[PDB]
C-alpha cells in the first residue's frame, strides 16, 4: 500500500522537449487529471493533461 | 523543484526498527496521511489517527 502521486499545481511554461525522458498519467483517483513529465535529470514535473504541447508531448513518447 | 506530483495516501503495523523517516500527505489530498519510510527505501501508507503512528512520528522528531 505504497502512496500514489498526483497533482495540483501545472507549469505554465512548455518545456523544451528535449529536456524530457518519460511520461506517465496520474492514476484517477487523483482529484485531477495529471500528466507526470520526468525530465532527463530525474525530475519530476506536473503538467496540464487538457493542454496541447503536454499532449503532443505524451504521444510523441509513444509513436 | 516547482510544481512537483504531491503524494496522496489511498489505502493504509510496522516494526520500528524498520523506521528510517517520515512524511506527512499534503492538506490538498483526500485523505490524511503519513508515510513512512523504511530502511530498505520503501514508502508506506498509515492512518495518523491510529496510535503507533502518531508515537513513531514522536519517536522521529523527539530524537
Known amino acids: 500500500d505504497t502512496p500514489t502521486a498526483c497533482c495540483f499545481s501545472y507549469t505554465s511554461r512548455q518545456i523544451p522537449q528535449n529536456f524530457i525522458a518519460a511520461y506517465f498519467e496520474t ?7 495529471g500528466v507526470i513529465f520526468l525530465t532527463k535529470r530525474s525530475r519530476q514535473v506536473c503538467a496540464d493533461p487538457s493542454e496541447e504541447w503536454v499532449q503532443k508531448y505524451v504521444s510523441d513518447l509513444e509513436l
Open 27 to 33: 492514476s484517477s483517483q487523483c482529484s485531477k487529471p
